[PDB]
Ligand binder design. Structure first.
Ligand SMILES: N[C@@H](CCC(=O)O)C(=O)O
Length: 417
């Protein structure tokens, strides 16, 4: 009584954050496994070629959920469910470089795509029509890698499904859609063929029902797509809010500070980066209140009302100090505080991968200046594929810690002594 779903380890799909497992596919697979009264077991594939290999052996996974494009036709050997999400392939280029207008303008550019993907096949055929088109494909990269590579200019163009872009665009300021390339199409789950429609029919029953019940559109808004974390405000705006907001809460930050033997101004910085000192702030991610705590985490810290500024401040402060208390003793202050900010955001599991990765690189797993260099690698498959817990958006962790420290510095400077 265990549903095995194979997927890809990636932000649009499945990954681990500080609260455990998450992702569009993962949630859809879980709400489905529950509709079957079985346990969901995730298995992840290394690349797309391997996913389909795995799906087609006997004794393999039930189905594949991985934002797969059917394309197909009638290879009965692999069969597709109804679609649960409609997308469009898009050519992506780097801002301030020659924006291609037409398929012919893909000639002369360096292009990279997932090896074994629909899009590699979309380009393969375009190469008959223009034998000068050249492109590379790789198994050691995921779409998140491709966008970074354009953003940073290591490649000119790539070709990806629009949803992957909607989720990530914001983490890549320099990238821009050049044009749609192909008709809109639907994504779907993949099952092996196929003589018993036992398994297929309910999936199709599930997806059809979950479309009219709002579940698909709910998820789509949950994930696709938005900037949780980021945003250093003006020094202007912070000075503003020092006068308009902090006076309400300074009292609570101070006492929690005292209660827990920790600098109140860092607690106050966490909260500013968190919600901008807004006790009613909330996210579609399911965090809420001044210290943007999750429900499980709030209950765990004794917070019975997430919207009460005093409670959320006390519970968030409690959460931060414990995380800082649980790090390896080998990490000393002040780095220790920075690791905890790093862990507060990305989860200790991932932070741990970073330190191992840091060690193996001959760096100091105890120096925030070093591990901080490793955290961004967790969003690079060549690297995160080699870690225990896999993908993490480590660049956003770094911004988190940085930003929080920055507010902490201004606060110190103004307080006072
Ligand atoms: N097939 C990949 C995209 C491949 C590419 O970017 O070229 C996906 O599942 O989104």
């Amino acid at each position: 009584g265990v549903l095995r779903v194979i997927t890809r380890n990636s932000p649009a799909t499945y990954f681990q954050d500080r609260n455990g497992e998450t992702g569009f596919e993962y949630e859809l697979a879980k709400r489905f496994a529950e509709r079957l009264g079985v346990e969901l077991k995730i298995e992840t594939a290394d690349n797309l070629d391997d996913l389909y290999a795995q799906l087609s052996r006997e004794g393999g996974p039930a189905l594949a959920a991985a934002g797969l494009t059917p394309g197909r036709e009638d290879d009965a050997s692999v069969r597709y469910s109804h679609t649960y999400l409609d997308v469009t392939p898009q050519i992506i280029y780097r801002n301030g470089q020659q924006r291609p207008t037409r398929p012919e303008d893909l000639v002369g550019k360096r292009i990279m795509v997932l090896k074994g993907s629909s899009h590699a096949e979309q380009l393969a055929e375009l190469k008959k029509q223009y034998p000068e088109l050249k492109y590379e494909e790789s198994d050691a990269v995921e779409v998140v890698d491709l966008l970074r590579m354009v953003d940073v200019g290591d490649i000119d163009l790539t070709l990806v499904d629009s949803n992957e872009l909607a989720m990530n665009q914001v983490y890549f300021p320099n990238v821009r859609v050049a044009f749609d390339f192909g008709e809109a199409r639907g994504l779907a789950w993949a099952l092996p063929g196929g003589d018993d429609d036992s398994l297929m029919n309910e999936v199709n029953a599930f997806l059809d029902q979950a479309k009219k019940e709002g579940l698909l559109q709910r998820l789509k808004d949950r994930y696709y797509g938005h900037v949780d974390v980021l945003g250093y405000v003006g020094a202007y705006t912070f000075a503003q809010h020092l006068q308009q907001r902090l006076p309400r809460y300074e009292s609570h930050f101070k006492q929690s500070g005292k209660q827990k033997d920790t600098d109140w101004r860092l607690l106050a910085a966490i909260g500013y980066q968190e919600s901008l000192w807004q006790p009613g702030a909330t996210s579609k991610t399911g965090v809420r209140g001044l210290m943007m705590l999750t429900n499980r985490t709030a209950q765990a810290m004794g917070v019975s009302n997430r919207l009460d500024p005093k409670q959320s401040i006390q519970g968030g402060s409690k959460y931060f100090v414990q995380i800082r208390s649980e790090l390896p003793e080998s990490i000393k202050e002040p780095d220790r505080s920075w690791f905890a900010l790093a862990a507060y955001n990305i989860g200790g599991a991932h932070l741990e991968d970073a330190r191992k990765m840091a060690e193996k690189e001959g760096l100091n797993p105890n120096k925030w200046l070093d591990v901080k260099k490793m955290l961004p690698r967790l969003a690079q498959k060549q690297w995160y594929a080699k870690t225990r817990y896999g993908y993490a958006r480590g660049g956003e962790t770094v911004h988190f810690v940085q930003n929080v420290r920055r507010y902490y510095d201004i606060l110190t400077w103004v307080t006072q002594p």
